[PDB]
Amino acid sequence: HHHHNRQQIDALVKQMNVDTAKGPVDERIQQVVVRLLGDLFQAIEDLDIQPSEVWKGLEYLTDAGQANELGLLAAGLGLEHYLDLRADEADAKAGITGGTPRTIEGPLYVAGAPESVGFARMDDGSESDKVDTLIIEGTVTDTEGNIIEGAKVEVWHANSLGNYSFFDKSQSDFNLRRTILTDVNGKYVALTTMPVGYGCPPEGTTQALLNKLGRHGNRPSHVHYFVSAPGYRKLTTQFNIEGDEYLWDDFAFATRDGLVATATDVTDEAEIARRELDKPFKHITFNVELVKEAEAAPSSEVERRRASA
């Protein structure tokens, strides 16, 4: 089945994509195209991939882009997690230690959420008779415990059905999405509802491929974070909730030590009144430690096309 060797493949890729160039070329794009196309041709030779199989692959990728699921596919195949493994190794090689650990952004961030200082209520109350109330609170500090005032804490999470606003058009714009600036004591408080885990769209392209791989498409319950402050490295992270069936079996491999929180139960009448609530609730503490920016530090910001509203 080997019709071309790697020398012959490299020569053909060069003839088609490099020899044909006239004038200014983007050298990085040229480098990446030449590498990936040569690698594709070699895998076609090694696995004897048939034309019908190549076309099915391209039709799948077309359908995935049309469904806006390529970000989801990157999470599910573990490419998104792999980028984090690389970033962690680059930071170790720089001697960066400390800081709350990073994990994946996922494909569902939306820019433009309501901003407030110290406190936000994240939900619109439309599920109040069908989901538990959750209070999240924490302090943002540097690596020696000094508070950081005015840190931007951005949080987003799913509703009682595992659905996110903006993507789920039945929810109000920005439901369960807020930006909270830490107060004079480095504190943020979010009044919200308990998120549930969820799967991929069952009839979508990501689940179709996972099915062929014998894999589920479920994530455990979590709340996403971006945390940033002047003079500090931006953080992309989450917390997970102890007790979830999928805690250590996330189809996107995002759970890590340091990021699992326990939801405590508050049933005490006095404490409930003090919080201005009328029913028992769940409470999570999630403190965040930020690493100070250094001249030597690799960038911790990621340019990525994100929804906005």
Ligand X SMILES: CCCCCCCC/C=C/CCCCCCCC(=O)O[C@H](COC(=O)CCCCCCCCCCCCCCC)COP(=O)([O-])O[C@@H]1[C@H](O)[C@H](O)[C@@H](O)[C@H](O)[C@H]1O
Site residues for ligand X per CB under 6 A: 28-29, 32-33, 36-37, 40, 49, 53-54, 56-58, 60, 63, 70, 73-74, 77, 79, 205, 208-209, 212
Residues 6+ apart with CB under 8 A from 277: 133
* 65: contact with a copy of itself by CB under 8 A: yes
Structure tokens at 302: 């990621």
* 7: contact with a copy of itself by CB under 8 A: no
Q: Which residues pair with 236 in a beta bridge?
A: 226
Shortest CB 257 distance to a copy of itself, Å:
17
Find the binder of a copy of itself among 7, 29, 129, 270 (CB under 8 A).
Answer: 29
Task: Tell whether residue 60 is among the known ligand binding residues.
Answer: no
Structure tokens at 167: 């993507």
Find the binder of a copy of itself among 11, 33, 277, 297 (CB under 8 A).
Answer: 33
Task: Tell whether residue 225 is among the known ligand binding residues.
Answer: no
Pattern 100-119, Fe ion, x by CB under 5 A:
------x-------------
* 217: contact with Fe ion by CB under 5 A: no
Rounded to an integer, what distance in angstroms lies between the CA atom of residue 98 and that of residue 100?
Answer: 7
* 54: contact with a copy of itself by CB under 8 A: yes
Rounded to an integer, what distance in angstroms lies between the CA atom of residue 284 and that of residue 14?
Answer: 57
* 302: contact with a copy of itself by CB under 8 A: yes
Closest by CA position to 105, among listed 252, 262, 260, 286? 252
* 125: contact with a copy of itself by CB under 8 A: no
DSSP state of 103: -
Pattern 180-219, a copy of itself, x by CB under 8 A:
-----------------------------x--xxxxx---
Nearer to Fe ion, 118 or 199 (CB): 199
Rounded to an integer, what distance in angstroms lies between the CA atom of residue 218 and that of residue 199?
Answer: 4
Nearer to ligand X, 60 or 226 (CB): 60
Dihedral pair phi/psi, residue 203, rounded to 5°: -100, 10
What amino acid occupies position 245? E
Residue 111's binding partner among a copy of itself, Fe ion, ligand X, none (Cβ under 5 to 8 angstroms by kind) is none
Nearer to ligand X, 54 or 117 (CB): 54
* 35: contact with a copy of itself by CB under 8 A: yes
Closest by CA position to 199, among listed 224, 162, 171? 162
Nearer to a copy of itself, 116 or 299 (CB): 299
Rg (CA), the chain: 23
Residues 6+ apart with CB under 8 A from 223: 136, 155, 156, 157, 195, 238, 239, 286
88, burial (CB in 10 Å: exposed 0-12, middle 13-18, buried 19+): middle
Dihedral pair phi/psi, residue 60, rounded to 5°: -60, -50
Shortest CB 234 distance to a copy of itself, Å:
12
Residue 213's binding partner among ligand X, a copy of itself, Fe ion, none (Cβ under 5 to 8 angstroms by kind) is a copy of itself
User: Between the CA atoms of 86, 91, 95 and 96, what dihedral angle is there, to the nearest 10 degrees?
Assistant: -140
Nearer to a copy of itself, 89 or 278 (CB): 89
Residues 6+ apart with CB under 8 A from 248: 255
Question: What residues line the site for Fe ion (CB under 5 A)?
Answer: 106
Q: Which residues make up each annotated binding site?
A: 164, 198, 222, 224
Residue ranges at the known binding site for Fe(3+)? 164, 198, 222, 224
